[PDB]
Amino acid sequence: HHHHHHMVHITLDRNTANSWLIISKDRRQVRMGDTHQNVSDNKERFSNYPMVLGAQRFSSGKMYWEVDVTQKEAWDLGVCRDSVQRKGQFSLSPENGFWTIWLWQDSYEAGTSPQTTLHIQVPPCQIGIFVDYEAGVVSFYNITDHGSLIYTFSECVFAGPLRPFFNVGFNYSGGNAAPLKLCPL
Ligand SMILES: CN(C)C(=O)N1CCOC[C@@]12CCOC2
Structure with missing residues (x-):
């Protein structure tokens, strides 16, 4: 894909976070706290x-x-x-x-x-x-595999302003504590 030039600098909104999340000082990383x-x-x-x-x-x-x-x-x-x-x-x-x-x-x-x-x-x-x-399009790309397409939602009915969305997942297993990180441009 050639979408890289529409890069935007995303930051996380503390006020929307579940009360167990820990957002880094730079608002670019989030992880599940143990309390x-x-x-x-x-x-x-x-x-x-x-x-x-x-x-x-x-x-x-x-x-x-x-x-x-x-x-x-x-x-x-x-x-x-x-x-x-x-x-x-x-x-x-x-x-x-x-x-x-x-x-x-x-x-x-x-x-x-x-x-x-x-x-x-x-x-x-x-x-x-x-x-x-x-266009009504949301697409996902596998950066690890040379940017290969994962999935395209088309004919999307957004019906309002859009916000970047994240879920770090639960950590019942003890194997899912790692953060989501917004990668540099
Ligand atoms: C940590 N944990 C397993 C939780 O129970 N949490 C804590 C974070 O908010 C979501 C809920 C899930 C059910 O509501 C509360």
Whole structure:
């Protein structure tokens, strides 16, 4: 792909984070803490899952960023509507305002309803995310495998401003403590 030139500098929005997340001082890395991180509750925080949004809002144009997923067992990545539900249980689906892929139990899947099996030969250490607002497109690229396509959501109905979306996953196993990191441009 030739999307690299639409690179945007993404930072994480503390105020949206689940109360167990630890966001680095530079707002470029996030990991699951082993306890509540001593923050007040607010209506923005994701309550049920280890999720956080980027601070940036996109309503037009072409945007590209990269995320490091090294050594993680489980995570979700993509974009979502600014108006997504924060409290209680929900599925990741375009009907609920999410355009995502994930790793879970040694398989990669796209967040369609129902979910779609992904075909990845080289487990990725870094993921590239491309959004074309006007075209209604969200695409995912395997940076570890020369930028090979993972998945394209097309005919997307964004229906509002979009925010970068992250889930570091639970760490019940003791094997998923590693952070998500926004990679330098
Ligand atoms: C750490 N853990 C397994 C949790 O139970 N947490 C803590 C972080 O917020 C989400 C919830 C899941 C169920 O609601 C609370």
